[PDB]
Amino acid sequence: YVPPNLPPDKKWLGTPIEEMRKMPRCGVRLPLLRPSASHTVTVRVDLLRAGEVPKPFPTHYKDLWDNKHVKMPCSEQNLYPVEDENGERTAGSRWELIQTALLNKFTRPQNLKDAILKYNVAYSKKWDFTALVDFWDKVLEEAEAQHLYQSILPDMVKIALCLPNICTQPIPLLKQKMNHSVTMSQEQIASLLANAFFCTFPRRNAKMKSEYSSYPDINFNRLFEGRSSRKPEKLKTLFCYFRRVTEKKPTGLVTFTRQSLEDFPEWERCDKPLTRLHVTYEGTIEGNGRGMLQVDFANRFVGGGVTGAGLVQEEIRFLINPELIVSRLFTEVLDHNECLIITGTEQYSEYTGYAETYRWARSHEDGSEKDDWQRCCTEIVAIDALHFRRYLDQFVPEKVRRELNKAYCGFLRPGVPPENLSAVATGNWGCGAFGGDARLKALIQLLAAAAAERDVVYFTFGDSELMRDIYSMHTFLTERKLNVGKVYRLLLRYYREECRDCSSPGPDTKLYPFIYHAAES
Template identity: 40%
Template sequence: MAEYTAVKLLGKGGFGVVYLIKDKKSDEVLALKTVDLDKASDDEKAFAEKEAKLMRGLEHSHVVQYVDSYFKGTTLLIFAEFCDGGDLQQFLNDSVSRIPEDLVVCWMTQVLSALEADIWSLGCVLFEITSGRRAIDEVSPHLLVFKVLTVGIPPIDKLYSKNLRIAGSKMVDKSQEKRPSTSELLSSSPFSDFIKKPKEPLSIMKETVFVTKWGTDQSVSNIQKLIEGLFLVISPLGKIIISKDSLAHYRKRKQKGSHVQPCAVDAVASSAVSPPPPVAVNQDKWDNYHVKMPCSPRNEYFDDDKGGSSSFSRRWDLIHETLNKSFADIDDLEKAINIINKANAVRSRFTSLRHYLTDCNTEKDLEEFLTTTLPNIRDLALALPTLFHEPIPLLKQGSKKSITLTQHQVACLLANAFFCTFPRRNSQEPQKEFCNYPDINFNGLFQDQSKRSDEKIRCILHYFMRVTQQMPQGKVTYRRQVIDRFPKWEELQTGLSKLTSSSDGTIEDSGQGMLQVLFANNHIGGSLYESFVGQQQARLFMCPEMIIARLFTESLGEDECLFMTGCEVFSMCAGLGDTFTWLGDRQDMTTRDEDGHRQTQIVAIDPLHIKNYKAQFQKDCLIRELNKAYTGFFNGDVPPAQLPWVVTGNWGCGASGGDKRLKALIQMLAASAAQRHLSFMTAGDDEFRGKLLEIHRYLSDRDFTVGQIVQLINGYHQEIIHQKRFGPRTNVFQFIMSSKD
């Protein structure tokens, strides 16, 4: 007999407790599940005994190995192999790059060969492995069933082979009869191909140069960290004995190579993203097509303080000298920014920044800001020449370009915006060089005296506190899209795509895996630093990496939009307008793609600002809004079946003054023309949610085309144009539903 000791508590469940146990002589570790059946019903006792018998009967290289089981009084003890490499979720969390197809096929083949698996559930697992996100992320059973029956499981990314995508699609077919069996799957490609030429997981990882933290000290499933982090156990079980025969049988199976044991993946393990390359000296462009960088040799100012003489001096030298001094108080910070902006328009006191730091913080918090956070922001800003080795292009009107930056680079640019170092960006007066770009320097934010200025500044400083404590190692891409050809809306024969709607939640919280709509201005962020906080402003303060788009994105044209991929959420906020409030830190758990982007994509589309209710139904206004929404929804590079849903809401309503029924119809029509489905968030308006689903059902059941619906909206305009009263007698939904089929 071998004697073991319970050393750590691994976890608890509704029916039992799991311990990590260790052999007193050999230090061999096992997992022990204990089930107290003292007060259990006969059914519960039978279930527990059945579990032990089931494990005893399973002997497969891809099933956790059973060791022994017996009763100790009224407690059932089940001994099993301890999986010291962590579970699949931990492995996915450790993964920096996309899971290689060979590794995916290897795992799926192992599961299919080991069990008579639930094929639909296994299909969901396959989707999660390949996408890094859950197939369905719903807690409510009703919503879960609704999504399964209506939306279904999204297709596997096109980066994987056609055969794997076909297999995945069949596995999650809504009809059970159409789903393949395990034997059918194993006899078809790509699983049959793998069976003919099998490989070990570690070999695949090394061959594909798979980037992961698994098997390293940084791994979330690192066994030593796991053991050190668990609670010590004073075992209530006394001596834990396992028969030598059971252990011998278990060890014999292990020696046959039942499992690949975890080890350091030295050749492929690395940090999430390598640091930016060293700067190539003097790689600078000072022209109308690139960002004018603060560290550029041509960023000069007229210096008349040199002992009575006057000359041009490099502003970066001034910035470096000024910021490398200590900051004793807010006056020092204000003075430093004013010195940096010699000959520029920044000469006012930073009322809102001063109020936030002195009136909204304790003396201890203020000291922490001045001695730690502020110097860290300074160091981040001054790293500009070493983090950028080539100029940043401007995303000018009409240009189909994209910019990819590391999160470290974005943070550095934002730190320079904090100190207002970007040249020629402190004025948006007509005829000024950057009058068609949003402001980027934070002087406007520091002077904002609106009710919500404290909350805005809190978001920004929290972001800097986070990134200076631990810099995120990912990437963000900003892409300007220009559409050359639009549908002929009144002639379009396309039917409506699918629609779901919810009155609970927000676009950012409910839109994981979907294309998320930002209710933008033609200048990204609009008057971001001043007064009003709408949906887009709130999103930018929660995700400050979106703010940097203002540095290089020219005002959006009628046929343009901006995509932002990989922006991380740093703050939890609530409310809009005068109720906008910072609630606390938020850890963004969205998975990253193989390039290091958070798998969040946001599209900024700007609606018209409506001053007259009837005018928005005019044909030119209607077509403009249809084209703008279509610009944001269209993606000609991806097959329609693989396009993610669009998640949106009351775009163009609120401060923009649009009719929410019309704007909802416009987005439904644009999504249908772009061959995408739509998820609509009604911001707590359950009545409108019902009306929206009703009109969609009415139109879909009668097979209305996009063109016919556009014509009905035109008809509504003719109906109301001559009405003298401001508000019409019937709204556009009522008009459509009263029309003849």
């Protein structure tokens, strides 16, 4: 069996993208937004109005300093050692110290370093600021620098110092195994992120031991270090966002949901049929996948190295939709059965290149519509693929199954009828440094989608051969009426027949050809 010839000029194959479901059109009427045991809501839902800045709930700051909530910089329990008249330790208020540190004229990058180190004195000989100096004094020309230190920086200080008036409700940690959502305003996120820039979140810096070993970095200190040339583009991207939100308060909401399933399908017996596919070697997940469930190829620590060195797919997404960064404040490292679903973030920047060639291009005007909770209609899911030391490891049935389950967790929305579900916009999940096979991972995601009753739009980013191969295989299987179980069975056969007893870097026969021979013969 050779697959037939397909049109050579054609940029996309399969179901016309016009026919895939997308939000807001496909969505279920949203119920009244309200708090519950499973949903923390940090705003006044009764006052929500398109184009008006949401009001915080409750009205006045309420603090929790414990192991279940974010430890806020503005807590009365955020303390530091002060010397009294005999040189003995008294406890002073770190928030008061932060305020007086940050309320100073920065005319010089050393002024900003000096401020940040006042309430971080333990890191005065650990945190390097070379990349900040470089950005400020060498990358930016004099006019940009001037605007940075007399307008943007002072306005970032202001929203950062208003944290207690803006984020008045404690934020719960989204811990491993929790099925829980937090919805908060874009304005709240701006204040949180301004605090992250100034490295204000307490207890999130220790290496040698911390309560937060299990969480991603949130403070931005590592953005300022090193002799990297990418770092200035990261800063430009983040300052594009900071300029925009300080010049004009954003008005939307954003929902962060951690989802765990304890019981997954017995894939061998799964009778669900394959769903629709649109596959193209042109277009972007964020651009052409507007209104669809957009996959973020995530590190189990969500955002990866975005607050430090790291600029591949996840990091780039967290920089252009920077409100995603705030997930790092409260999202515990993801276990195999978990994902994080973020709804409402907005794209503030456009960019070109990737990793070492990445550059900020320009400001982006997100033209999304907003749902009935005034979230931008942009849903992103962080699902982390496995890292394979050796190519063949990924065909082991337990690894195939782990990837199926992870993707299925990302895609499933329990309760919601499949007709109110948007298509998934994805691509080569885990196929760069993580060693994954594009053709296997394409098929795993197709099976995951099918079991979750969703269509798929798959972007191959310039690989037309991969486009055609993926299209050919989906059509072969659908034409022959092979449900998810039959396909998973063939993946197992490939392993047993071609991988299990193979002493070689690769096997003698590739997966897709094996499937064609096996299924038809």
